[PDB]
C-alpha cells in the first residue's frame, strides 16, 4: 500500500513550517508565487554549496531569507561580497528589500537532504548503488543516529527491468507521531533514465 508523508503528518506536533508569514486572501497566491521563484533561484545558483532548507519570512512589506548550508564559507564569499549580490537579486525578484542569514549545519551526514543529494551525485558518476547506500548507512550510524533507512528505486545498473532496493538499521517507527523523523528525496538522471532516492532518519522520541 501507500504511505503518508512523514513531514506532513507531524507539522502540528514536532515539525515546524518553512514559511511563517500571515496574509489575507488577496495576497496569498502572490506570496506563494514569489516564494516559489525565490526558492527555485537560490536552488539554482547554490547547488555546489550543499544547502538543506530555505526559510522565508515576511515581517512587514519586506522579506528575510535564511539558508541552512554545510559550507557557509563558500556561500559568504570574500568579506560578504556574495551575500550582498544575492540579497540584491532576491530584492529584484520579490519586489521588496531583503535580508539574508546563513546557518551552519553541524554534522552534515545527519541531514536527509544532503545524503540524498550525495547519493544522487555518486549515481551520476557511475558508482554501484549498493556501495554508496552502505556508505550512507554507516556514516549516518557512526555519528549517533538512532536509525536510518535508505531506499533506491528505478532502472538500476542500466537493466532492462526496473526494481526497488532498500537498507535499514536501527529504529524507524513511522507510525509514532511524536518521534523525530527527517525524510527527504532526490532524483538522478542517468544515461538510461531517472532513479529515485528516499532517506528516513530517526533521531529522538520527543
Amino acid at each position: 500500500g501507500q504511505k503518508v508523508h512523514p513531514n506532513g503528518i507531524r507539522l502540528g506536533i514536532v515539525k515546524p513550517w518553512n514559511s511563517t508569514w500571515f496574509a489575507n486572501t488577496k495576497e496569498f497566491a502572490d506570496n506563494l508565487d514569489s516564494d516559489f521563484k525565490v526558492r527555485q533561484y537560490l536552488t539554482k545558483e547554490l547547488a555546489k554549496a550543499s544547502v538543506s532548507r530555505i526559510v522565508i519570512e515576511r515581517p512587514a512589506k519586506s522579506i528575510r531569507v535564511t539558508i541552512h548550508t554545510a559550507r557557509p564559507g563558500i556561500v559568504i564569499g570574500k568579506k560578504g561580497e556574495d551575500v550582498e549580490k544575492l540579497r540584491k537579486v532576491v530584492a529584484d525578484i520579490a519586489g521588496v528589500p531583503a535580508q539574508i542569514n546563513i546557518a551552519e549545519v553541524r554534522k552534515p551526514e545527519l541531514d536527509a537532504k544532503l545524503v540524498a543529494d550525495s547519493i544522487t551525485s555518486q549515481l551520476e558518476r557511475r558508482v554501484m548503488f549498493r556501495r554508496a547506500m552502505k556508505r550512507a548507512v554507516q556514516n549516518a550510524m557512526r555519528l549517533g543516529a538512532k536509525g536510518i533507512k535508505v531506499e533506491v528505486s528505478g532502472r538500476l545498473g542500466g537493466a532492462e527491468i526496473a526494481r526497488t532496493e532498500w537498507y535499514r538499521e536501527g529504529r524507524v517507527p513511522l507510525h509514532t507521531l511524536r518521534a523525530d523523523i527527517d525524510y527527504n528525496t532526490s532524483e538522478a538522471h542517468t544515461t538510461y533514465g531517472v532513479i529515485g532516492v528516499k532517506v528516513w532518519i530517526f533521531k529522538g522520541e520527543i
Binding site: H5, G8, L11, S19, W21, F22, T25, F28, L32
Partner: protein, 100 residues
C-alpha cells in the same frame, strides 16, 4: 500545458486591462434607461469594434506553475496536485491535515 496556451493567456490579460475603461464607459452608456435610443444604437455598434480578447470572460484560470486548466483553487492559485505537493513540505503557512 503547451506554451501557446500560456502566451494566449498573457495576451488576453494585456488586452483586457488595456481596454477596461473604454469597455466600462460604453457598457455604462448602454445600461442606462434615461438616454436616446439612437445613442444606444451607436454605443452597441461601437462595442463590437473592440477585439474580442478584451473581454474578462475570455480568460481561464490556470495553475501558476504547470498550466493545468482543471482543478483550480482561487485561494492558493494552484491545482490539487501542486497544492498537495507544496502543502506536504510545509511551504504553505498554517495549512495542515484536518480531522474532526
Amino acid at each position: 500545458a503547451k506554451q501557446s496556451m500560456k502566451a494566449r493567456e498573457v495576451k488576453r490579460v494585456a488586452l483586457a486591462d488595456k481596454y477596461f475603461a473604454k469597455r466600462a464607459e460604453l457598457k455604462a452608456i448602454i445600461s442606462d434607461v434615461n438616454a436616446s435610443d439612437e445613442d444606444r444604437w451607436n454605443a452597441v455598434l461601437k462595442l463590437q469594434t473592440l477585439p474580442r480578447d478584451s473581454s474578462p470572460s475570455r480568460q481561464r484560470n490556470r495553475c501558476r506553475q504547470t498550466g493545468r486548466p482543471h482543478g483550480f483553487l482561487r485561494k492558493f492559485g494552484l491545482s490539487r496536485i501542486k497544492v498537495r505537493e507544496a502543502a506536504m513540505r510545509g511551504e504553505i503557512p498554517g495549512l495542515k491535515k484536518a480531522s474532526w
